[PDB]
């Protein structure tokens, strides 16, 4: 009911890194404090590292196990955007703002970081556990994928959106907004594929899959809180970032056809400013009574 519509929306959102000139960001970058520059670098590396997993494994593995030519095509398009567009865009932002040696060090740090690694490996673990012709394991991986696309990225997106909403780092903020807009539709689409599997299950199996999804969300959420304090306490933003994480967790759940887990909260206004039963023929004698 939905793949051709998503095909259309995906291809009409096509864009390339070269379209946004990045050099003019140096005119606001130079005015940020060390903590602001440090947080931005770390957040950016976090997003880059997670998005690489999605391009190399997450999207291609789902495309491999999903049946249907049109779905495989949409999924291929999404994988292309991760690898050919998003990855180049993140690299471009980095090369503009930091010298080569600084980029290498930030990636070394974020690569060793406990909270980034915990979530990255949790997601990758579920992708590696998909078994051929087993729709339960596929569903679990789709849940992981939706959580990455619609939830885990947002502790990171917060900061570029925060600057973007203030008139700072506008070129890289525009790029991030385009990336985020792609991840939103990726999350919604994979969510619909997960609901299709979920709806084919018994009531007991459904309850079991719901428990899986909520348990996974809880593990990721508790790590996000730690990740958030680790990055944002030094710039005084953690309270507001936490509200943004919960709001996006609720969107991820709704993508999977589940109820919101967290109470509704208002979001930081600066970040907001940045943001067929069965056909049977009539065989006569049905017109007579």
């Amino acid at each position: 009911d939905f793949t051709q519509m998503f095909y259309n929306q995906n291809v009409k959102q096509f864009w390339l890194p070269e379209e946004i000139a990045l050099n003019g960001d140096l005119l606001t970058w130079k005015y940020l404090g060390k903590n602001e520059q440090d947080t931005y670098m770390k957040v950016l590396a976090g997003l880059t590292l997670l998005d690489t997993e999605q391009g190399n494994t997450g999207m291609p593995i789902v495309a491999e196990h999903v049946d249907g030519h049109q779905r495989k095509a949409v999924l291929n398009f999404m994988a292309m955007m991760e690898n050919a567009v998003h990855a180049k865009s993140y690299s471009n932002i980095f090369m503009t703002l930091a010298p080569t040696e600084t980029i290498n060090e930030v990636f070394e740090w974020v690569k060793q970081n406990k909270y980034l690694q915990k979530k990255a490996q949790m997601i990758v673990g579920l992708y590696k556990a998909i078994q051929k012709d087993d729709e339960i394991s596929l569903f679990k991986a789709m849940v992981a994928s939706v959580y990455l696309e619609s939830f885990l990225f947002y502790s990171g997106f917060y900061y570029p959106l925060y600057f973007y909403g203030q008139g700072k780092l506008m070129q890289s903020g525009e790029i991030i907004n385009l990336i985020l807009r792609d991840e939103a539709i990726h999350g919604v689409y994979v969510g619909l594929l997960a609901q299709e599997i979920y709806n084919k299950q018994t009531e007991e199996k459904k309850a079991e899959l719901r428990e899986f999804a909520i348990d996974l969300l809880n593990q990721l959420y508790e790590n996000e809180l730690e990740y958030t304090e680790d990055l944002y306490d030094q710039v005084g933003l953690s309270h507001d970032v936490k509200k943004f994480i919960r709001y996006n967790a609720n969107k991820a759940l709704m993508n999977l056809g589940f109820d919101p887990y967290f109470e509704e909260e208002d979001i930081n206004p600066i970040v907001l400013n940045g943001l067929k039963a069965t056909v049977e023929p009539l065989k006569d004698d049905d017109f007579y009574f």
Partner: protein, 683 residues
């Protein structure tokens, strides 16, 4: 989690193997005592409250000035003398969330149930204190419920129209199409659902003044109307809802149906425009015999005969159209079209099915016009005349566009009070008042037809609730016996009240003299057949109440012949969506979809057992999907024989039901005299 929400959630907690139905009384009591009494603005006296409401642009000073303050105080006394209590949490929640008057910031509550009922009654009476007290007694006893527009808006300064169903004829011209779009936007702005007849519009690939194959057909107008309804979205409050009707013999019928397919192209699909198909008996006859049928280009028929294709009787004109070489047509398979209709209804619930000859064989105003289409809810079936909207400098030829005022009797409360006659007559008076006080300044045909026809719709609700609370199965023959007797009485007293109003005002509706009421042909089955109950149990339900006999119907026929009839149309059974919760009633005459209604409001989930549900009557509250749709058709046809307009008839289907089963239900409805079919709801 609110305390009342927790208490309402304890219904599903099964104690001793049974639902805790008594928790809903605790739930509503907690809801009131903890939220409503806290958020209800209180005034020292009623005078201060009334002054605050009129001066702060909440009420209308015109209708309140018709009474001395003593009379208004006594009316409010009558409302509060009943000490009305909402039986369930959902009743009070729905009232205080949808109909209760709130402050301009929607923070506090100005109106209780009694205040709203008193204001509605004072507006209905139009200066009569005893009449206002009678309306207060009728509504606080919950025997009669004015429709959502009337109940919500009566006596309010910043109100929408009291009518929400409109039916527009669209003529085959760009001037008329533009005027139809304008009127649709104006009526949707007022908050009313608009139904448009697209059968007169010429099909796709027709000539426009010597330029052949130039017309986009009814689908271009459909897109225009869909965007018009999307734009006129009731000030961004509620989504603009409209309906389009096309005859099944229209050439664009397949394009008309393709707008509702899930795979429909974005340049064809319409989102906010419901579709209804009008089916004459000729189409059913062609499909029955499997003869290949013809759909016709309307403009060729208009050019050949000077009359619109939908203005003519297809039963006599179909062979002439087919044999006419100057009439353009294409072959279709009527059985394939029926299967496509059933498939579309299974997939999306659309289209509405209106059986044209079922409506018009019992239509009392065929002299004015035949009924060509229905409203957005598929129960309004009235004669319409298309308007000829000319150029700007010229004078328009205004026709008749349908718009009737809705009200619902509570069958349970009317039956327990033994007040069929009094409730029916008071409801007729209130609907007449709403009709007279309605003036729409941007729909000239709607206004003209409201002034001329004076048509009202008096519906009924809580049929399944009344039957299940009296130990009668909905599909049982006793249920149909009760429906027969009850709606015969309702028709009798509505006709009597209409004739009494005609005698009092000395005027009937326009072109009454040609109606079957004037000739007495309407009363034939009533002066020939007895409609008293055939079962002792049903006859006991009407104890203490005079059931009209054949002699009573003859007296009514003589009275109508002598004095005329004030309303062209009186009775139509609307769905009664949200007012059913407030009245603690089952929706319309339909059977209940679920025994206990699970809904989520905000972040909290709510539970609504059907009114009167308990352990003793649990299995009399049979869900609609578990029911035999043939027996539901039988019930609705039993009711339909006493309703001059149609009934909103929703089909409740299981997932296992095929296209053939839906087609069989539709054909049995056609066979049994069903006028319209509203929705195909699948479980």
């Amino acid at each position: 989690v609110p305390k009342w929400i927790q208490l309402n959630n304890e219904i599903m907690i099964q104690k001793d193997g049974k639902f805790q139905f008594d928790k809903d009384k605790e739930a509503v009591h907690s809801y009131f005592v903890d939220y409503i009494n806290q958020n209800t603005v209180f005034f020292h006296n009623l005078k201060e409250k009334l002054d605050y409401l009129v001066e702060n642009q909440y009420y209308e000073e015109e209708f309140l000035s018709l009474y001395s303050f003593e009379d208004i105080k006594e009316v409010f006394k009558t409302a509060y003398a009943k000490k009305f209590r909402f039986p369930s949490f959902m009743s009070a929640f729905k009232f205080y969330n949808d109909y209760a008057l709130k402050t301009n910031d929607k923070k506090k509550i100005l109106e209780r149930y009694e205040d709203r009922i008193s204001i509605v009654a004072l507006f209905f009476a139009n200066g009569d204190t005893e009449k206002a007290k009678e309306y207060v007694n009728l509504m606080i006893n919950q025997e009669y419920q004015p429709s959502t527009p009337t109940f919500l808006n009566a006596g309010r300064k910043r109100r929408g129209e009291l009518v929400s169903c409109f039916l527009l004829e669209v003529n085959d011209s760009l001037n008329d199409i533009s005027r139809a779009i304008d009127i649709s936007m104006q009526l949707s702005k007022l908050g009313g659902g608009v139904s448009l007849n697209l059968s007169k519009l010429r099909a796709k690939g027709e000539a426009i003044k010597d330029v052949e194959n130039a017309t986009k057909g009814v689908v271009g107008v459909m897109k225009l109307l869909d965007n018009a309804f999307r734009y006129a979205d009731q000030m961004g409050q509620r989504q603009g809802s409209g309906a389009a009707y096309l005859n099944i013999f229209h050439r664009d019928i397949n394009d008309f149906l393709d707008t509702k397919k899930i795979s429909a192209d974005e340049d064809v699909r319409v989102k906010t425009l419901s579709i209804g198909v009008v089916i004459p008996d000729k189409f059913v006859e062609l499909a029955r015999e499997d003869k290949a049928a013809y759909v016709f280009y309307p403009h060729t028929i208009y050019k050949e005969y000077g009359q619109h294709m939908d203005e003519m009787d297809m039963n006599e004109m179909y062979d002439k159209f087919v044999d006419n070489p100057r009439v353009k047509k294409e072959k279709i398979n009527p059985r394939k079209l029926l299967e496509k209709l059933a498939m579309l209804r299974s997939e999306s619930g659309y289209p509405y099915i209106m059986f044209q000859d079922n409506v018009n064989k019992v239509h009392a105003n065929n002299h004015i016009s035949k009924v060509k289409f229905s409203n957005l809810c598929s129960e309004v079936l009235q004669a319409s005349q298309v308007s000829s909207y000319t150029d700007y400098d010229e004078e328009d030829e205004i026709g008749l566009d349908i718009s009737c005022n809705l009200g619902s009797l509570n069958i349970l409360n009317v039956m327990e009070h033994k007040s069929i006659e009094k409730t029916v007559k008071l409801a007729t008076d209130s609907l007449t008042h709403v009709s007279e006080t309605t003036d729409i300044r941007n729909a000239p045909a709607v206004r003209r037809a409201n002034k001329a026809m004076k048509s009202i719709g008096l519906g009924a609700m809580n049929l399944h609730g009344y039957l299940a609370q009296n130990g009668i199965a909905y599909e049982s023959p006793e249920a149909r016996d009760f429906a027969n007797t009850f709606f015969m009485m309702v028709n009798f007293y509505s006709i009597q009240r209409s004739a009494e109003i005609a005698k009092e005002k000395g005027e009937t509706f326009d072109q009454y003299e040609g109606s079957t009421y004037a000739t007495g042909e309407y009363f034939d089955k009533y002066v020939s057949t007895d409609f008293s109950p055939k079962y002792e149990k049903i006859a006991n339900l009407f104890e203490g109440m005079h059931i009209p006999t054949t002699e009573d119907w003859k007296k009514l026929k003589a009275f109508v012949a002598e004095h005329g009839m004030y309303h062209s149309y009186r009775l139509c059974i609307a769905p009664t969506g949200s007012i059913s919760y407030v009245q603690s009633s089952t929706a319309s005459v339909m059977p209940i979809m679920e025994r206990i209604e699970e809904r989520t409001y905000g972040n909290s989930k709510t539970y609504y057992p059907m009114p009167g549900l308990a352990s003793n009557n649990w299995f009399f509250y049979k869900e609609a999907y578990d029911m035999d749709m043939f027996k539901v058709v039988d019930m609705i046809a039993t009711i339909q024989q006493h309703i001059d307009q149609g009934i909103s008839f929703t089909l409740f289907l299981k997932d296992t039901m095929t296209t053939r089963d839906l087609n069989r239900i539709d054909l049995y409805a056609h066979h049994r005299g069903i006028k319209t079919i509203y929705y195909a709801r699948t479980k």
